[PDB]
Amino acid sequence: IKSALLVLEDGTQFHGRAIGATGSAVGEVVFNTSMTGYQEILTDPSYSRQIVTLTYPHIGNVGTNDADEESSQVHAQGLVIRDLPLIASNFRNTEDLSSYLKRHNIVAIADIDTRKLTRLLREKGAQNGCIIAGDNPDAALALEKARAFPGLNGMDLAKEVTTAEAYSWTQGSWTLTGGLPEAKKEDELPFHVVAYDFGAKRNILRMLVDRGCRLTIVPAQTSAEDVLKMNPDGIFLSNGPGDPAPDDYAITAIQKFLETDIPVFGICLGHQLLALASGAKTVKMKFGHHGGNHPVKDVEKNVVMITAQNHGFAVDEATLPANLRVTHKSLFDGTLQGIHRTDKPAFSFQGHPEASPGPHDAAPLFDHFIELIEQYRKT
């Protein structure tokens, strides 16, 4: 018997089985509706400090493999699932889920009523939690831990996940046939993009490289000055955990770039940052958007895209400056999904155009950025 237990702030208890490392884990609990893509979700830096619950009962069906890693490590604080399959069964598998979790030292629990858990987070909004895995998990300790938690709600996550020193990225996407490509040569890519690492997902980088960009990955605290110094073709604001304070460094530098004519593109936190820097306000969502089937309407063309979402905070549409025009909204809740600066060559998207995991419907957002780049380079 390998007991494991999860307790909520509110004291709710879920008793089950341990499937990863031994010990405890605390964080804000979130649910994700993605039927596929578990490895990609667990390795997404935006899930730092969070305890991820997956709604799809069977998790680990396909084991794991390096190409499905969205970063250098598992960022989820813990994992909560209904069922851990007896075996992984996929030609791509290189290690079963359990050994992987162990390997990465993640506390994980299986065999609990994830639908009850989900219904609860939906109904009552996000909550803090602690998972304890061990011989005799103490539910009072777990409860303490959960209650004590400072939470996300006024935390600087991105600084935690960002890169120490800047670096170069020129590797492109994976393919069934060839797998993940050898990284390109500098001279093989026409554009240079500077990307702010706020806990950026590998897929975004790869997809940019797919489109012609040679990358320069910079620490989130990197100054606008130092940057401009590199003579960028475009500036990219990565995805990342938490939310930024109106207060913080990055908003400052962004605004600078925005004084310039360099094209700016933001994804998720990056979109947030762009809106804050443009004088818009951000809110914390009840429970957020965590899934891969989220309908997003491009209001400009009147079309719908099925999107990959991963965000707890959202841009106030009401607090939207006039130089900020609405480009997309959620068809699930009507929340703000995309914006464009009328005055500048900058735009952002709340969702994950790079998916991974999820549908590829939003990929073209990337192409507008290329367009932008191409024009800038024309002038």
């Binding site: 649910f31 509706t33 709604t55 799809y56 009962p57 069977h58 069906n61 209904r82 069922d83 399959p85 007896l86 075996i87 069964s89 009523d113 639908r115 009850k116 989900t118 219904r119 939906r122 109904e123 899934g291 089937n293 699930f332």
Partner: protein
């Protein structure tokens, strides 16, 4: 799971191929694959209570039959897969014969190993914990019974004792990301229940016929829908029980509440238990529901319309003869023979040509 009727076509090639030979299909929902499969197996209306064996453990020739059934699939293959694990074959062995993904095979195998423990500890070994684990894997009371060497009722008794009952989850198209007002449910062995039955209205429950088969068609389903539609209009809270995915009966708009479940005594009782309906119609879904009538009544269900006993009067050869008699009505001359020579004589009595019903 598809529903076949080969037994009705004696000289037919009964091997499965690119040309459909199925006459229907059942569906089941479960929180797990194991649970979902077992539930479908027990709702197939073939007499299965789950992975019931097809060949014996002491049959020296078993491996050969099993081998054949795995390599060249017939309608019985699902049961020969388990028989295979019973007999010593590896998952890799099964895989090579069938080409069924091991992700599935390992699951069936685990079920077999569980069955083995059951058989081993018998009813006494069925403590609350263990019995709960089994239920969770989709095991039917009937199947456990069989392995434990008791009547189904005994397994059910035990559940009542442990207060071991399922909960009902709802279908919502979104994995609970949004709430629903629709009552489309399935049973599972979990924590939270979402049935939330009303205490408000007078309820009527209509039992469907499970998967269609020859002689048990859409006609019955037609009737089932009509009941629901009619009594709903008349002011009753209508509850449909059925697991045939092809019909209008399992359409959520057809009834107030839909339970997409196996039409069995075990399944139906659990529902009755929480719904406490005013009455239950068992005469419209054909043989499946008809066959449950007496047990239902006996266990306390308010069956309505023509009674279980009445229905028996008619169906039973003897009871009927008797009635026909009593009314002084015309009935072909018959006989109830036992042996070869008996009939020949009796035949002589009755007269050719003869109709020989077994």
């Amino acid at each position: 799971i598809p529903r076949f009727n080969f037994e009705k076509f004696a000289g037919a090639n009964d091997r499965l191929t690119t040309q459909m030979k199925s006459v229907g299909e059942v569906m089941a929902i479960g929180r797990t694959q194991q649970e979902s499969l077992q539930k479908a197996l027990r709702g197939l209306e073939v007499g299965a209570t789950g992975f019931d064996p097809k060949v014996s453990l002491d049959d020296p020739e078993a491996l050969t039959k099993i081998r054949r059934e795995l390599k060249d699939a017939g309608a019985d293959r699902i049961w020969y897969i388990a028989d295979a694990f019973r007999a010593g074959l590896s998952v890799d062995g099964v895989f090579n014969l069938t080409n069924i993904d091991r992700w599935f095979l390992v699951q069936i195998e685990e079920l077999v190993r569980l069955e083995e423990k059951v058989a081993e500890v018998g009813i006494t070994g069925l403590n609350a914990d263990f019995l709960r684990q089994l239920k969770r894997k989709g095991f039917a009371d009937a199947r456990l019974a069989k392995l434990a060497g008791v009547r189904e009722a005994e397994i059910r008794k035990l559940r009542d004792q442990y207060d071991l009952h399922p909960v009902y989850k709802r279908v919502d198209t979104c994995a609970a990301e949004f709430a629903t007002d629709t009552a489309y449910m399935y049973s599972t062995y979990e924590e939270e229940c979402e049935a939330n039955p009303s205490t408000d209205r007078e309820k009527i429950m209509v039992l469907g016929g499970g998967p269609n088969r020859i002689g048990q068609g859409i006609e019955f389903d037609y009737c089932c829908v009509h009941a629901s539609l009619a009594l709903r209009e008349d002011g009753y809270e209508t509850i449909m029980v059925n697991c045939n995915p092809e019909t209008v009966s399992t359409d959520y708009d057809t009834s107030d509440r839909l339970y997409f479940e196996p039409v069995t005594l075990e399944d139906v009782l659990e529902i009755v238990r929480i719904e406490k309906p005013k009455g239950v119609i068992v005469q419209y879904g054909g043989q499946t529901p008809l066959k449950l009538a007496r047990a239902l009544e006996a266990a306390g269900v308010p069956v309505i319309g023509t009674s279980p006993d009445a229905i028996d009067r008619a169906e039973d050869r003897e009871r009927f003869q008797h009635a026909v008699e009593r009314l002084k009505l015309k009935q072909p001359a018959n006989a109830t023979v036992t042996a070869i020579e008996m009939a020949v004589e009796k035949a002589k009595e009755i007269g050719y040509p003869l109709v020989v019903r077994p």
